[PDB]
Amino acid sequence: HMELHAITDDSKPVEELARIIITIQNEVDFIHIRERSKSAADILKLLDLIFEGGIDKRKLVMNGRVDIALFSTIHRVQLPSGSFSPKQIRARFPHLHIGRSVHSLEEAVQAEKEDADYVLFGHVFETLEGRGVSLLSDIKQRISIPVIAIGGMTPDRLRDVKQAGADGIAVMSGIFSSAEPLEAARRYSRKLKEMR
Amino acid sequence: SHMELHAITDDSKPVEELARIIITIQNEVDFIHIRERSKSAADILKLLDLIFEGGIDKRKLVMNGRVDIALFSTIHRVQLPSGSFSPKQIRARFPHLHIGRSVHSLEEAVQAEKEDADYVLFGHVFGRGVSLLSDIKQRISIPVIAIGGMTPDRLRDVKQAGADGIAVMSGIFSSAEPLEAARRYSRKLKEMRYE
Ligand SMILES: Cc1nc(C(=O)O)sc1CCOP(=O)(O)O
Ligand SMILES: Cc1nc(C(=O)O)sc1CCOP(=O)(O)O
């Protein structure tokens, strides 16, 4: 079984983004809130809209803003490269599930040592010096926490990623840039099932 | 009689340049608010490393917005934007922090005091702004730092009206010589205290 993570695209007004989030929630396993260029005031407004729209809070992951996760009762955070260590986070907030975004074998190895719960590895298909799919396989062999692949994920590339050993994939533009995000998300989950 | 001088960073400069400026001005101001709204956590933490290795006094530092960065950097002072966390929330989890709120009307100032802020920044002041500042200073009993168009020639009016301090962004960080800009503000404050 392979997880599907949806990643918001830091491009839409909160009302539109909120609608899309509510619509796709049963087609994906996790939704990462990654609105880098919005203020905390705007992100809290977004969260208020999806909470009152009935979103299942267990599926939400806050990228980067540990403070917003803490004051919104969101229990999963994704930490970018160069930001807080998982050790600092876990020392004071042991209830948090913690992901690390990593871009090399050695950074993946170090994340497991600092007690991350899982890693996001990419950018897999960006033209990492072409080493994306091979490294994915090397990382999976070397660590024992889950590995989620990100960067250029499309339905036609999922077999390669699956064969390399990924425990799931992460998708941004493939869903949130679609004219029909629900259908877009469905293409991914259908392909994932058909590979079974 | 002592009026505080708060310098506010301007979210416009590469971290290396901003670090240099912060170190040169540190003895001329009382507080420096890190307000790099467009930069990531990784970049802000790189800024803090540069100024810590440059020798800065950490007790002068205030984090705007990013309570997580303040906490994991042993900075004890945060400034909370309008529409963000309430001071009550912050104080329940991190009671050792000194907490400021940014407010833009008399009613928002009164509310900030009720929600247990330690002080407010009120702006933008720059006749209508100063009058409102004066009205707030009777309405609440926590300190009020005035912000918005603060220049040396406007400092006497602001002080006479009751401000406990002033906050300055472009008057310092948009200068050719940020240290000499800061000195103009501190010299004028000193004259006023002695006169
Ligand atoms: C959000 C993100 N993180 C990456 C990493 O390597 O950390 S690559 C990426 C963007 C993925 O976008 P899309 O599905 O449109 O390709
Ligand atoms: C950061 C900030 N807050 C304001 C408020 O009214 O809340 S005005 C402002 C910028 C003030 O810049 P300068 O000294 O260049 O006039």
CSV table of C-alpha atoms and ligand atoms in Angstrom, one decimal:
chain,number,residue,atom,x,y,z
A,1,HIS,CA,0.0,0.0,0.0
A,2,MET,CA,1.3,3.4,-1.0
A,3,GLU,CA,0.3,6.7,0.6
A,4,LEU,CA,-0.7,9.7,-1.4
A,5,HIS,CA,0.2,13.1,0.0
A,6,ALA,CA,-1.3,16.3,-1.5
A,7,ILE,CA,0.8,19.5,-1.2
A,8,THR,CA,-0.8,23.0,-1.4
A,9,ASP,CA,0.7,25.3,-4.0
A,10,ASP,CA,1.1,28.7,-2.4
A,11,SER,CA,-0.8,30.3,-5.2
A,12,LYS,CA,-4.5,30.8,-4.4
A,13,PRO,CA,-6.7,33.0,-2.2
A,14,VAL,CA,-7.7,31.2,1.0
A,15,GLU,CA,-11.4,30.8,0.1
A,16,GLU,CA,-10.6,29.0,-3.2
A,17,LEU,CA,-7.9,26.8,-1.6
A,18,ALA,CA,-10.3,25.9,1.3
A,19,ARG,CA,-12.9,24.6,-1.2
A,20,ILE,CA,-10.4,22.5,-3.1
A,21,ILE,CA,-9.1,21.0,0.2
A,22,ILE,CA,-12.6,20.0,1.3
A,23,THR,CA,-13.3,18.5,-2.1
A,24,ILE,CA,-10.3,16.2,-2.4
A,25,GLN,CA,-10.0,14.9,1.2
A,26,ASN,CA,-11.3,11.4,0.6
A,27,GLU,CA,-9.1,10.8,-2.4
A,28,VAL,CA,-5.8,11.4,-0.4
A,29,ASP,CA,-4.1,10.2,2.8
A,30,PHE,CA,-2.5,13.5,3.9
A,31,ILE,CA,-2.7,17.2,3.0
A,32,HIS,CA,0.4,19.4,3.7
A,33,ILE,CA,-0.4,23.1,4.2
A,34,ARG,CA,2.6,24.8,2.5
A,35,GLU,CA,1.5,28.4,2.0
A,36,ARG,CA,5.1,29.8,2.3
A,37,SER,CA,4.2,33.3,1.2
A,38,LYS,CA,1.1,33.8,3.4
A,39,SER,CA,1.2,35.4,6.9
A,40,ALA,CA,0.1,33.5,10.0
A,41,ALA,CA,-3.1,35.6,10.1
A,42,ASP,CA,-4.0,34.3,6.6
A,43,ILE,CA,-3.1,30.7,7.3
A,44,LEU,CA,-5.2,30.8,10.5
A,45,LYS,CA,-8.2,32.0,8.4
A,46,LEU,CA,-7.6,29.1,5.9
A,47,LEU,CA,-7.6,26.6,8.8
A,48,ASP,CA,-10.8,28.1,10.3
A,49,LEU,CA,-12.5,27.7,6.9
A,50,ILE,CA,-11.6,24.0,6.5
A,51,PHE,CA,-12.3,23.2,10.1
A,52,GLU,CA,-15.8,24.7,9.8
A,53,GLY,CA,-16.1,22.9,6.5
A,54,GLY,CA,-15.6,19.6,8.4
A,55,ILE,CA,-12.1,18.5,7.3
A,56,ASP,CA,-10.7,15.5,9.1
A,57,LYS,CA,-7.9,17.1,11.2
A,58,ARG,CA,-5.9,13.8,11.4
A,59,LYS,CA,-5.0,14.2,7.7
A,60,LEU,CA,-3.5,17.7,8.0
A,61,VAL,CA,0.3,18.3,8.0
A,62,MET,CA,1.7,21.8,8.7
A,63,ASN,CA,4.9,22.6,6.6
A,64,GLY,CA,7.4,24.8,8.4
A,65,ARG,CA,5.2,26.7,10.9
A,66,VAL,CA,5.6,24.7,14.1
A,67,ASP,CA,3.9,27.5,16.0
A,68,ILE,CA,0.7,27.4,13.9
A,69,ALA,CA,0.6,23.6,14.3
A,70,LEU,CA,0.8,23.9,18.1
A,71,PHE,CA,-2.0,26.5,18.4
A,72,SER,CA,-4.4,24.8,15.9
A,73,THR,CA,-4.3,21.3,17.4
A,74,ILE,CA,-2.5,19.9,14.3
A,75,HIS,CA,-0.3,17.0,15.3
A,76,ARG,CA,1.9,16.5,12.2
A,77,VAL,CA,4.7,18.9,11.0
A,78,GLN,CA,7.0,18.7,8.0
A,79,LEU,CA,10.4,20.3,8.6
A,80,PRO,CA,12.4,21.8,5.6
A,81,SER,CA,16.1,21.4,5.2
A,82,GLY,CA,18.1,24.0,7.2
A,83,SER,CA,15.2,24.6,9.7
A,84,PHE,CA,14.6,23.1,13.2
A,85,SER,CA,16.1,19.7,14.1
A,86,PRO,CA,13.6,16.9,15.0
A,87,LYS,CA,15.5,16.5,18.3
A,88,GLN,CA,14.7,20.1,19.5
A,89,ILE,CA,11.0,19.6,18.4
A,90,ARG,CA,10.7,16.2,20.1
A,91,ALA,CA,12.3,17.4,23.3
A,92,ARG,CA,9.5,19.8,24.1
A,93,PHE,CA,6.5,18.5,22.0
A,94,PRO,CA,6.8,14.7,22.0
A,95,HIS,CA,3.2,14.3,20.8
A,96,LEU,CA,4.1,15.6,17.3
A,97,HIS,CA,4.7,13.3,14.3
A,98,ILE,CA,7.7,14.7,12.5
A,99,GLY,CA,8.7,14.6,8.8
A,100,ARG,CA,12.0,15.8,7.4
A,101,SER,CA,12.6,17.1,3.8
A,102,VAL,CA,15.9,15.7,2.6
A,103,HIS,CA,17.9,16.0,-0.6
A,104,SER,CA,20.8,13.4,-0.3
A,105,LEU,CA,21.6,10.0,1.1
A,106,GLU,CA,23.6,11.5,4.0
A,107,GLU,CA,20.9,14.0,5.0
A,108,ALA,CA,18.4,11.1,5.0
A,109,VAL,CA,20.7,9.1,7.2
A,110,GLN,CA,21.1,12.1,9.6
A,111,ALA,CA,17.3,12.6,9.8
A,112,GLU,CA,16.7,9.1,11.1
A,113,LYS,CA,19.5,9.6,13.7
A,114,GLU,CA,17.8,12.9,14.9
A,115,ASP,CA,14.6,10.8,15.3
A,116,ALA,CA,12.4,11.9,12.4
A,117,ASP,CA,9.3,9.7,11.9
A,118,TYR,CA,9.7,9.7,8.0
A,119,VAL,CA,11.3,11.7,5.2
A,120,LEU,CA,10.2,13.4,2.0
A,121,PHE,CA,12.9,12.9,-0.6
A,122,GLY,CA,13.2,15.0,-3.8
A,123,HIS,CA,13.3,16.7,-6.2
A,124,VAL,CA,13.1,13.3,-7.9
A,125,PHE,CA,12.6,14.4,-11.6
A,126,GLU,CA,14.0,18.0,-11.7
A,127,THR,CA,16.6,18.5,-14.4
A,128,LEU,CA,19.9,16.3,-7.8
A,129,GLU,CA,22.0,15.8,-11.0
A,130,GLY,CA,19.7,13.1,-12.3
A,131,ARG,CA,20.3,10.8,-9.3
A,132,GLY,CA,16.7,11.0,-8.1
A,133,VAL,CA,15.4,7.5,-8.8
A,134,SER,CA,18.7,5.7,-7.8
A,135,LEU,CA,19.1,7.6,-4.6
A,136,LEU,CA,15.5,6.8,-3.8
A,137,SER,CA,16.5,3.2,-3.9
A,138,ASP,CA,19.7,3.7,-1.9
A,139,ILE,CA,17.9,5.7,0.8
A,140,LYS,CA,15.3,3.0,1.2
A,141,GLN,CA,18.0,0.4,1.6
A,142,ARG,CA,19.9,2.4,4.2
A,143,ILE,CA,17.2,3.7,6.6
A,144,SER,CA,14.2,2.0,8.2
A,145,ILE,CA,11.7,4.8,8.5
A,146,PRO,CA,9.2,5.5,5.6
A,147,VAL,CA,10.3,7.4,2.4
A,148,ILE,CA,7.9,9.6,0.5
A,149,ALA,CA,8.9,10.6,-3.0
A,150,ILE,CA,8.4,14.2,-4.3
A,151,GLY,CA,9.1,16.3,-7.4
A,152,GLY,CA,7.5,15.8,-10.8
A,153,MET,CA,5.2,13.0,-9.7
A,154,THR,CA,2.7,12.0,-12.4
A,155,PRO,CA,0.6,8.9,-13.0
A,156,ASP,CA,3.0,7.6,-15.7
A,157,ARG,CA,6.1,7.7,-13.3
A,158,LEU,CA,4.6,5.9,-10.4
A,159,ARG,CA,5.7,2.4,-11.4
A,160,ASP,CA,9.4,3.5,-11.5
A,161,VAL,CA,9.0,5.1,-8.0
A,162,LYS,CA,7.2,2.0,-6.7
A,163,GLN,CA,9.9,-0.3,-8.0
A,164,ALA,CA,12.6,1.9,-6.4
A,165,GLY,CA,10.9,1.1,-3.1
A,166,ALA,CA,9.1,4.4,-2.2
A,167,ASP,CA,6.4,4.1,0.6
A,168,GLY,CA,4.3,6.8,-1.0
A,169,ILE,CA,4.3,9.9,-3.3
A,170,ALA,CA,3.7,13.6,-2.8
A,171,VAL,CA,1.9,15.7,-5.5
A,172,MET,CA,1.6,19.5,-5.8
A,173,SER,CA,0.9,20.9,-9.3
A,174,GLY,CA,-0.6,17.5,-10.6
A,175,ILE,CA,-3.7,18.2,-8.4
A,176,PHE,CA,-3.9,21.9,-7.5
A,177,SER,CA,-3.2,23.2,-11.1
A,178,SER,CA,-5.8,20.9,-12.6
A,179,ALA,CA,-9.0,22.4,-13.9
A,180,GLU,CA,-10.6,19.5,-12.0
A,181,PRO,CA,-8.6,18.7,-8.8
A,182,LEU,CA,-11.0,15.8,-7.7
A,183,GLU,CA,-10.5,14.1,-11.0
A,184,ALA,CA,-6.8,14.7,-11.0
A,185,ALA,CA,-6.5,13.2,-7.5
A,186,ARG,CA,-8.6,10.2,-8.8
A,187,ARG,CA,-6.1,9.5,-11.6
A,188,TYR,CA,-3.4,9.0,-9.1
A,189,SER,CA,-5.3,6.8,-6.7
A,190,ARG,CA,-6.6,4.7,-9.6
A,191,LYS,CA,-3.1,4.1,-10.9
A,192,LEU,CA,-1.9,3.2,-7.4
A,193,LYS,CA,-4.7,0.6,-7.1
A,194,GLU,CA,-4.1,-0.8,-10.6
A,195,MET,CA,-0.5,-1.5,-9.5
A,196,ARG,CA,-2.0,-4.2,-7.1
B,1,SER,CA,11.4,60.0,31.4
B,2,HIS,CA,13.2,57.3,29.4
B,3,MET,CA,11.8,56.7,25.9
B,4,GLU,CA,12.6,53.4,24.2
B,5,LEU,CA,13.9,53.2,20.6
B,6,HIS,CA,12.9,50.1,18.6
B,7,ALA,CA,14.5,49.4,15.2
B,8,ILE,CA,12.4,47.3,12.9
B,9,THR,CA,14.2,45.3,10.0
B,10,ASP,CA,12.8,46.0,6.5
B,11,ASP,CA,12.4,42.6,4.8
B,12,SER,CA,14.5,43.8,1.8
B,13,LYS,CA,18.2,42.7,2.2
B,14,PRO,CA,20.3,39.5,1.8
B,15,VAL,CA,21.0,38.0,5.3
B,16,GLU,CA,24.8,38.8,5.2
B,17,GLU,CA,24.1,42.6,4.6
B,18,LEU,CA,21.3,42.7,7.2
B,19,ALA,CA,23.5,41.0,9.8
B,20,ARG,CA,26.3,43.6,9.3
B,21,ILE,CA,23.8,46.4,9.8
B,22,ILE,CA,22.2,44.9,12.9
B,23,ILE,CA,25.7,44.6,14.6
B,24,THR,CA,26.8,48.2,13.8
B,25,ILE,CA,23.6,49.7,15.3
B,26,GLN,CA,23.2,47.6,18.4
B,27,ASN,CA,24.5,50.2,20.9
B,28,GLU,CA,22.3,53.0,19.6
B,29,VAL,CA,18.9,51.3,20.1
B,30,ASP,CA,17.1,49.5,22.9
B,31,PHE,CA,15.5,46.7,20.8
B,32,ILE,CA,15.7,45.2,17.2
B,33,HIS,CA,12.6,43.5,15.8
B,34,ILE,CA,13.4,40.8,13.3
B,35,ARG,CA,10.5,41.1,10.8
B,36,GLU,CA,11.7,39.4,7.6
B,37,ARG,CA,8.2,38.3,6.5
B,38,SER,CA,9.4,37.0,3.1
B,39,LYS,CA,12.2,34.9,4.3
B,40,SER,CA,12.0,31.2,5.3
B,41,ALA,CA,12.8,29.8,8.7
B,42,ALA,CA,16.1,28.4,7.3
B,43,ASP,CA,17.2,31.9,6.2
B,44,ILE,CA,16.1,33.6,9.4
B,45,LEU,CA,18.0,31.0,11.4
B,46,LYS,CA,21.1,31.8,9.2
B,47,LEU,CA,20.7,35.5,10.0
B,48,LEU,CA,20.6,34.7,13.7
B,49,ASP,CA,23.7,32.5,13.5
B,50,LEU,CA,25.5,35.4,11.7
B,51,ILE,CA,24.6,38.0,14.4
B,52,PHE,CA,25.3,35.5,17.3
B,53,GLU,CA,28.8,34.9,15.9
B,54,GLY,CA,29.1,38.6,15.3
B,55,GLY,CA,28.7,39.2,19.1
B,56,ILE,CA,25.1,40.6,19.5
B,57,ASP,CA,23.4,41.0,22.9
B,58,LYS,CA,20.4,38.5,22.6
B,59,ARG,CA,18.3,40.5,25.2
B,60,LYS,CA,17.8,43.2,22.7
B,61,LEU,CA,16.2,40.9,20.1
B,62,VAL,CA,12.5,40.7,19.4
B,63,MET,CA,11.0,38.1,16.9
B,64,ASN,CA,8.0,39.4,14.9
B,65,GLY,CA,5.4,36.7,14.1
B,66,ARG,CA,7.6,33.5,14.3
B,67,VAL,CA,7.1,32.3,17.9
B,68,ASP,CA,8.7,28.9,16.9
B,69,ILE,CA,12.0,30.6,15.9
B,70,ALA,CA,12.1,32.8,19.1
B,71,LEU,CA,11.5,29.7,21.2
B,72,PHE,CA,14.2,27.5,19.7
B,73,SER,CA,16.7,30.4,19.5
B,74,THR,CA,16.4,31.4,23.2
B,75,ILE,CA,15.0,34.8,22.2
B,76,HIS,CA,12.6,35.8,25.1
B,77,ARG,CA,10.5,38.5,23.3
B,78,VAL,CA,7.9,38.2,20.6
B,79,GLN,CA,5.7,40.8,18.7
B,80,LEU,CA,2.3,39.4,17.6
B,81,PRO,CA,0.6,40.8,14.4
B,82,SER,CA,-3.0,41.7,14.1
B,83,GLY,CA,-5.1,38.6,13.4
B,84,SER,CA,-2.5,36.1,14.6
B,85,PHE,CA,-2.1,34.2,18.0
B,86,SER,CA,-3.6,35.7,21.1
B,87,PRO,CA,-1.3,36.6,23.9
B,88,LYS,CA,-3.3,34.2,26.2
B,89,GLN,CA,-2.5,31.2,24.0
B,90,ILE,CA,1.2,32.2,23.9
B,91,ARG,CA,1.4,32.7,27.6
B,92,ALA,CA,-0.2,29.3,28.5
B,93,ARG,CA,2.5,27.4,26.6
B,94,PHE,CA,5.5,29.7,27.0
B,95,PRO,CA,5.0,31.8,30.1
B,96,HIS,CA,8.6,33.0,30.1
B,97,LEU,CA,8.1,35.2,27.0
B,98,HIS,CA,7.5,39.0,27.0
B,99,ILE,CA,4.6,39.6,24.6
B,100,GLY,CA,3.9,42.6,22.4
B,101,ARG,CA,0.8,43.2,20.2
B,102,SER,CA,0.5,45.3,17.0
B,103,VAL,CA,-2.7,47.3,17.1
B,104,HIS,CA,-4.3,49.8,14.7
B,105,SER,CA,-7.3,51.3,16.5
B,106,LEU,CA,-8.4,52.3,20.0
B,107,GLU,CA,-10.6,49.3,20.4
B,108,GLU,CA,-7.9,46.8,19.3
B,109,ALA,CA,-5.6,48.4,21.9
B,110,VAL,CA,-8.1,48.1,24.7
B,111,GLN,CA,-8.7,44.4,23.7
B,112,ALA,CA,-5.0,43.7,23.6
B,113,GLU,CA,-4.7,44.8,27.3
B,114,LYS,CA,-7.7,42.6,28.2
B,115,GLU,CA,-6.0,39.5,26.5
B,116,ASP,CA,-2.9,40.2,28.7
B,117,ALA,CA,-0.4,41.7,26.3
B,118,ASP,CA,2.7,43.3,28.1
B,119,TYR,CA,2.8,46.3,25.7
B,120,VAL,CA,1.5,47.5,22.3
B,121,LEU,CA,2.8,49.0,19.1
B,122,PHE,CA,0.3,51.5,17.8
B,123,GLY,CA,0.4,52.8,14.2
B,124,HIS,CA,0.5,54.3,11.8
B,125,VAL,CA,0.7,57.6,13.6
B,126,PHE,CA,1.8,59.8,10.6
B,127,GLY,CA,-2.8,65.3,13.5
B,128,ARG,CA,-5.3,62.4,13.6
B,129,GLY,CA,-2.7,59.7,14.5
B,130,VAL,CA,-1.2,61.7,17.5
B,131,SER,CA,-4.7,62.5,18.9
B,132,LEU,CA,-5.5,58.7,18.8
B,133,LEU,CA,-2.2,57.9,20.5
B,134,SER,CA,-3.1,60.4,23.3
B,135,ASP,CA,-6.6,58.8,23.7
B,136,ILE,CA,-5.1,55.3,23.9
B,137,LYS,CA,-2.6,56.3,26.6
B,138,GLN,CA,-5.5,57.3,28.9
B,139,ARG,CA,-7.5,54.2,28.0
B,140,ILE,CA,-4.9,51.4,28.8
B,141,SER,CA,-2.2,51.2,31.4
B,142,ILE,CA,0.4,49.0,29.5
B,143,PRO,CA,3.2,50.8,27.5
B,144,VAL,CA,2.5,52.2,24.0
B,145,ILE,CA,5.3,52.3,21.3
B,146,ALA,CA,4.4,54.6,18.5
B,147,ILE,CA,5.1,53.5,14.9
B,148,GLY,CA,4.6,55.0,11.3
B,149,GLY,CA,6.5,57.9,9.8
B,150,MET,CA,8.8,58.4,12.9
B,151,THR,CA,11.5,61.0,12.1
B,152,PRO,CA,13.7,63.0,14.5
B,153,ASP,CA,11.7,66.2,14.0
B,154,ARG,CA,8.5,64.5,15.0
B,155,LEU,CA,9.8,63.1,18.2
B,156,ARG,CA,8.7,65.9,20.6
B,157,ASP,CA,5.1,65.8,19.6
B,158,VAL,CA,5.0,62.0,20.1
B,159,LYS,CA,6.7,62.2,23.4
B,160,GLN,CA,4.5,65.1,24.7
B,161,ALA,CA,1.4,63.0,23.7
B,162,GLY,CA,2.5,60.2,26.1
B,163,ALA,CA,4.3,57.5,24.0
B,164,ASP,CA,6.6,55.3,26.0
B,165,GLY,CA,8.8,54.7,22.9
B,166,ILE,CA,9.0,54.9,19.1
B,167,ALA,CA,9.7,52.3,16.4
B,168,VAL,CA,11.6,53.0,13.2
B,169,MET,CA,12.0,51.0,10.0
B,170,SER,CA,13.0,53.0,6.9
B,171,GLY,CA,14.5,56.0,8.8
B,172,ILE,CA,17.3,53.6,9.8
B,173,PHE,CA,17.4,50.6,7.3
B,174,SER,CA,16.9,52.7,4.2
B,175,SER,CA,19.8,55.0,5.1
B,176,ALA,CA,23.2,55.3,3.4
B,177,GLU,CA,24.6,55.2,6.9
B,178,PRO,CA,22.3,53.2,9.3
B,179,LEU,CA,24.5,54.0,12.4
B,180,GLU,CA,24.4,57.7,11.8
B,181,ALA,CA,20.6,57.6,11.1
B,182,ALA,CA,20.2,55.7,14.5
B,183,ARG,CA,22.3,58.4,16.3
B,184,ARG,CA,20.1,61.2,15.0
B,185,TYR,CA,17.1,59.5,16.8
B,186,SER,CA,19.0,58.7,20.0
B,187,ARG,CA,20.6,62.2,20.3
B,188,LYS,CA,17.2,63.9,19.9
B,189,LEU,CA,15.8,61.6,22.6
B,190,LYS,CA,18.7,62.4,25.0
B,191,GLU,CA,18.2,66.2,24.5
B,192,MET,CA,14.6,65.9,25.3
B,193,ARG,CA,15.2,64.0,28.5
B,194,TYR,CA,17.7,66.6,29.7
B,195,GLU,CA,15.7,69.6,28.6
C,1,LIG,C1,7.1,21.1,-2.3
C,1,LIG,C2,8.3,20.4,-3.0
C,1,LIG,N1,9.4,20.0,-2.2
C,1,LIG,C3,10.4,19.4,-2.9
C,1,LIG,C4,11.6,18.9,-2.2
C,1,LIG,O1,12.5,18.3,-2.8
C,1,LIG,O2,11.6,19.2,-1.0
C,1,LIG,S1,10.1,19.4,-4.6
C,1,LIG,C5,8.5,20.2,-4.4
C,1,LIG,C6,7.5,20.6,-5.5
C,1,LIG,C7,6.7,19.4,-6.1
C,1,LIG,O3,5.8,19.9,-7.0
C,1,LIG,P1,5.1,19.1,-8.1
C,1,LIG,O4,4.2,17.9,-7.7
C,1,LIG,O5,4.3,20.1,-8.9
C,1,LIG,O6,6.2,18.7,-9.0
C,2,LIG,C1,6.1,47.5,10.5
C,2,LIG,C2,5.0,48.5,10.6
C,2,LIG,N1,3.8,48.4,11.3
C,2,LIG,C3,3.0,49.4,11.2
C,2,LIG,C4,1.6,49.5,11.9
C,2,LIG,O1,0.9,50.5,11.8
C,2,LIG,O2,1.3,48.4,12.5
C,2,LIG,S1,3.6,50.7,10.3
C,2,LIG,C5,5.1,49.8,9.9
C,2,LIG,C6,6.2,50.3,9.1
C,2,LIG,C7,6.7,51.7,9.6
C,2,LIG,O3,7.8,52.1,8.7
C,2,LIG,P1,8.6,53.5,8.8
C,2,LIG,O4,9.4,53.8,10.1
C,2,LIG,O5,9.4,53.3,7.5
C,2,LIG,O6,7.5,54.6,8.6
